[PDB]
Design an enzyme around this catalytic site. Structure first.
Site, PDB file in Angstrom:
ATOM      1  N   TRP A  83       0.815  -1.211   0.000  1.00  0.00           N
ATOM      2  CA  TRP A  83       0.000   0.000   0.000  1.00  0.00           C
ATOM      3  C   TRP A  83       0.854   1.269   0.000  1.00  0.00           C
ATOM      4  O   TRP A  83       0.629   2.184  -0.802  1.00  0.00           O
ATOM      5  CB  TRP A  83      -0.928  -0.028   1.219  1.00  0.00           C
ATOM      6  CG  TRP A  83      -1.768   1.194   1.372  1.00  0.00           C
ATOM      7  CD1 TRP A  83      -1.585   2.210   2.268  1.00  0.00           C
ATOM      8  CD2 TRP A  83      -2.930   1.528   0.614  1.00  0.00           C
ATOM      9  NE1 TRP A  83      -2.563   3.160   2.107  1.00  0.00           N
ATOM     10  CE2 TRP A  83      -3.404   2.763   1.099  1.00  0.00           C
ATOM     11  CE3 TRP A  83      -3.617   0.903  -0.429  1.00  0.00           C
ATOM     12  CZ2 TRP A  83      -4.534   3.386   0.573  1.00  0.00           C
ATOM     13  CZ3 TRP A  83      -4.742   1.523  -0.947  1.00  0.00           C
ATOM     14  CH2 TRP A  83      -5.188   2.749  -0.443  1.00  0.00           C
ATOM     15  N   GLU A 124      -0.154  -1.932  -5.825  1.00  0.00           N
ATOM     16  CA  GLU A 124      -1.460  -1.455  -5.363  1.00  0.00           C
ATOM     17  C   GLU A 124      -1.732  -0.064  -5.939  1.00  0.00           C
ATOM     18  O   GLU A 124      -1.390   0.947  -5.320  1.00  0.00           O
ATOM     19  CB  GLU A 124      -1.525  -1.489  -3.822  1.00  0.00           C
ATOM     20  CG  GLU A 124      -1.222  -2.891  -3.278  1.00  0.00           C
ATOM     21  CD  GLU A 124      -1.693  -3.142  -1.860  1.00  0.00           C
ATOM     22  OE1 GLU A 124      -2.176  -2.212  -1.185  1.00  0.00           O
ATOM     23  OE2 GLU A 124      -1.591  -4.308  -1.419  1.00  0.00           O
ATOM     24  N   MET A 189      -6.691 -10.700  -1.728  1.00  0.00           N
ATOM     25  CA  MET A 189      -6.689  -9.964  -0.459  1.00  0.00           C
ATOM     26  C   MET A 189      -8.125  -9.745   0.021  1.00  0.00           C
ATOM     27  O   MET A 189      -8.678  -8.641  -0.015  1.00  0.00           O
ATOM     28  CB  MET A 189      -5.922  -8.656  -0.598  1.00  0.00           C
ATOM     29  CG  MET A 189      -4.435  -8.860  -0.826  1.00  0.00           C
ATOM     30  SD  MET A 189      -3.489  -7.321  -0.767  1.00  0.00           S
ATOM     31  CE  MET A 189      -3.884  -6.625  -2.370  1.00  0.00           C
TER      32      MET A 189
HETATM   33  C1  LIG Z   1       6.743   0.088   5.174  1.00  0.00           C
HETATM   34  C2  LIG Z   1       5.630   1.014   5.693  1.00  0.00           C
HETATM   35  O1  LIG Z   1       5.098   1.816   4.951  1.00  0.00           O
HETATM   36  N1  LIG Z   1       5.206   0.927   7.127  1.00  0.00           N
HETATM   37  C3  LIG Z   1       4.127   1.807   7.642  1.00  0.00           C
HETATM   38  C4  LIG Z   1       2.855   0.973   7.693  1.00  0.00           C
HETATM   39  O2  LIG Z   1       2.404   0.753   6.427  1.00  0.00           O
HETATM   40  C5  LIG Z   1       1.821  -0.559   6.292  1.00  0.00           C
HETATM   41  C6  LIG Z   1       0.483  -0.674   6.997  1.00  0.00           C
HETATM   42  O3  LIG Z   1      -0.441   0.355   6.524  1.00  0.00           O
HETATM   43  C7  LIG Z   1      -0.140  -1.993   6.735  1.00  0.00           C
HETATM   44  N2  LIG Z   1      -1.546  -2.067   7.259  1.00  0.00           N
HETATM   45  C8  LIG Z   1      -1.885  -3.165   8.197  1.00  0.00           C
HETATM   46  C9  LIG Z   1      -3.334  -3.245   8.691  1.00  0.00           C
HETATM   47  O4  LIG Z   1      -1.065  -3.924   8.549  1.00  0.00           O
HETATM   48  C10 LIG Z   1      -0.288  -2.282   5.249  1.00  0.00           C
HETATM   49  O5  LIG Z   1      -0.718  -3.596   5.075  1.00  0.00           O
HETATM   50  C11 LIG Z   1      -1.308  -3.848   3.807  1.00  0.00           C
HETATM   51  C12 LIG Z   1      -0.286  -4.208   2.652  1.00  0.00           C
HETATM   52  O6  LIG Z   1       0.409  -3.078   2.125  1.00  0.00           O
HETATM   53  C13 LIG Z   1      -1.095  -4.835   1.630  1.00  0.00           C
HETATM   54  N3  LIG Z   1      -0.473  -5.782   0.978  1.00  0.00           N
HETATM   55  C14 LIG Z   1      -0.948  -7.030   1.407  1.00  0.00           C
HETATM   56  N4  LIG Z   1      -0.475  -8.329   0.913  1.00  0.00           N
HETATM   57  C15 LIG Z   1      -1.080  -9.582   1.438  1.00  0.00           C
HETATM   58  C16 LIG Z   1       0.594  -8.391  -0.092  1.00  0.00           C
HETATM   59  O7  LIG Z   1      -1.940  -6.964   2.340  1.00  0.00           O
HETATM   60  C17 LIG Z   1      -2.248  -5.556   2.437  1.00  0.00           C
HETATM   61  C18 LIG Z   1      -2.052  -5.094   3.908  1.00  0.00           C
HETATM   62  C19 LIG Z   1      -3.421  -4.942   4.667  1.00  0.00           C
HETATM   63  O8  LIG Z   1      -4.164  -3.911   4.050  1.00  0.00           O
HETATM   64  O9  LIG Z   1       1.062  -2.162   4.637  1.00  0.00           O
HETATM   65  C20 LIG Z   1       1.631  -0.826   4.805  1.00  0.00           C
HETATM   66  C21 LIG Z   1       2.914  -0.794   4.033  1.00  0.00           C
HETATM   67  O10 LIG Z   1       2.592  -0.971   2.670  1.00  0.00           O
HETATM   68  O11 LIG Z   1       1.768   1.730   8.364  1.00  0.00           O
HETATM   69  C22 LIG Z   1       2.155   2.148   9.732  1.00  0.00           C
HETATM   70  C23 LIG Z   1       0.961   2.887  10.216  1.00  0.00           C
HETATM   71  O12 LIG Z   1      -0.160   2.235   9.590  1.00  0.00           O
HETATM   72  C24 LIG Z   1       3.424   3.007   9.721  1.00  0.00           C
HETATM   73  O13 LIG Z   1       3.836   3.186  11.084  1.00  0.00           O
HETATM   74  C25 LIG Z   1       4.520   2.284   9.014  1.00  0.00           C
HETATM   75  O14 LIG Z   1       4.785   1.105   9.803  1.00  0.00           O
END
Ligand SMILES: CC(=O)N[C@H]1[C@H](O[C@H]2[C@@H](O)[C@@H](NC(C)=O)[C@H](O[C@H]3[C@H](O)[C@H]4N=C(N(C)C)O[C@H]4[C@@H]3CO)O[C@@H]2CO)O[C@H](CO)[C@@H](O)[C@H]1O
Length: 374
Positions: A83, A124, A189
């Site tokens: 994301w 995404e 997903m």
């Molecule tokens: C590396 C980074 O940007 N870390 C951010 C963190 O971003 C995360 C979270 O928003 C995740 N959300 C959750 C509920 O865990 C998010 O998860 C997404 C992911 O991108 C998508 N891809 C999948 N796959 C199965 C391939 O599933 C979805 C999940 C669920 O929606 O991923 C982003 C990074 O892309 O966000 C926190 C605060 O939200 C921030 O501190 C930092 O850690």
């Protein structure tokens, strides 16, 4: 043949205390495929580490793939995208043969040097968000997968994707038969169906229709069954459809605490977990502990959607527990799906603080897949 695809959000190593989750917290026998999230790209296609201090300098890529020393049958993939990585750079890369070739070669270099077994692509999304080329992304995504497969076959490497779930999302991004053709499997997903961005409360991963929804045009609702049946009907064979499940919930602030059913007006995002620290979502580890420690919460089952939810004054939380996970895996078994994908391992109750053993959600997945219950 059934598989369990475990994603690891590698930034969980920076959580403190009981929320900290490192590579050595992973049980490599509870997954068949373990996916390191995330690497990224630039618009010119260069694959790159998003946290090189962790991934490279502190050896995290290699510690992760070294889990194969404990479970030699485990497959360890690296996931590109996510994301937070957005769409623009992937749109630019996929449209240019030179940039696609650069991505294939640089991602392959990371895979081989760090001992990964393949690549998971989580763009995404094609033709959405900050896409540059719009509808052309649908074609270029399939071309990219074709070219990755052609190169990866020289090394026996896996190629997988993670895709948006419901029909109205999927038709914006994918040609399903050409995506399925080139990949070992598609991780659908089947979560984030509803969340704090909505005007009313709703379930993160309802299996069927939810309380408060109309049964007219039932096929248009955002639920797991509609998404799975869409992907099957659009040409994804069951042996390539891996059904996603969430190890986190989503949180809301009710508009009126006395109106607390699913599909009740919401004012925005709700509570945050103490370790994930983001209003609007909470890990299962965090929320099961909250429920165990605070008796004032009311937990109810939506017996239409087959998922639990909880409320306490202004708080309304959709989540998944052992019982709803069981229903999800039984559904997957009933349609002979290839397996279960989970986002993400670091928010299971990995320390077993909630009284159902360590990794209760992940153990449930493994148990129900092994037993074959439909
Ligand atoms: C590396 C980074 O940007 N870390 C951010 C963190 O971003 C995360 C979270 O928003 C995740 N959300 C959750 C509920 O865990 C998010 O998860 C997404 C992911 O991108 C998508 N891809 C999948 N796959 C199965 C391939 O599933 C979805 C999940 C669920 O929606 O991923 C982003 C990074 O892309 O966000 C926190 C605060 O939200 C921030 O501190 C930092 O850690």
């Amino acid at each position: 043949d059934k598989i369990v695809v475990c994603y690891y959000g590698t930034w969980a190593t920076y959580r403190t205390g009981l929320g900290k989750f490192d590579v050595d917290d992973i049980d490599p026998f509870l997954c068949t495929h373990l996916v390191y999230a995330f690497i990224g790209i630039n618009a010119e296609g260069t694959a790159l580490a998003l946290d090189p201090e962790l991934d490279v300098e502190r050896g995290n890529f290699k510690q992760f793939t070294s889990l194969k020393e404990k479970n030699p049958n485990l497959k360890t993939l690296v996931a590109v995208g996510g994301w937070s990585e957005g769409s623009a750079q992937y749109s630019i890369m996929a449209a240019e043969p030179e940039y696609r070739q650069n991505f294939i070669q640089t991602s392959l270099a990371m895979i081989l040097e760090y001992n990964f077994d393949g690549l998971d692509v989580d763009w995404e999304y094609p033709n959405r968000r900050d896409t540059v080329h719009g509808e052309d992304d649908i074609e270029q995504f399939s071309t990219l997968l074709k070219e990755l497969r052609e190169e990866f076959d020289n090394y026996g490497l896996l190629l997988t994707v993670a895709v948006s779930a419901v029909e109205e999302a999927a038709v914006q991004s994918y040609d399903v038969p050409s995506v399925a053709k080139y990949v070992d499997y598609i991780g659908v997903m089947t979560y984030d169906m509803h969340g704090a961005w909505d005007s009313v409360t709703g379930h993160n991963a309802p299996l069927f229709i939810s309380e408060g929804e109309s049964a007219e045009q039932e096929s248009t609702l955002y639920n797991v069954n509609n998404a799975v049946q869409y992907w099957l009907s659009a040409g994804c064979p069951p042996e390539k459809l891996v059904m996603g499940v969430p190890f986190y919930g989503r949180t809301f602030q009710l508009s009126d605490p006395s109106v607390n059913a699913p599909n009740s007006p919401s004012n925005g995002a709700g509570l945050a977990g103490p370790y994930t620290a983001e209003s609007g979502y909470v890990g299962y580890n965090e929320f099961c502990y909250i429920l165990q420690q605070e008796s004032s919460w009311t937990v109810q089952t939506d017996n239409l959607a087959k998922v639990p939810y909880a409320f306490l004054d202004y708080n309304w939380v959709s989540f998944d527990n052992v019982e709803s996970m069981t229903a999800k895996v039984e559904y997957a078994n009933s349609f002979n799906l290839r397996g279960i994908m989970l986002w993400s391992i670091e928010t299971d109750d990995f320390h077993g603080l909630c009284g159902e053993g360590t990794f209760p959600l992940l153990n449930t997945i493994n148990t129900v897949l092994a037993e074959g219950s439909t």
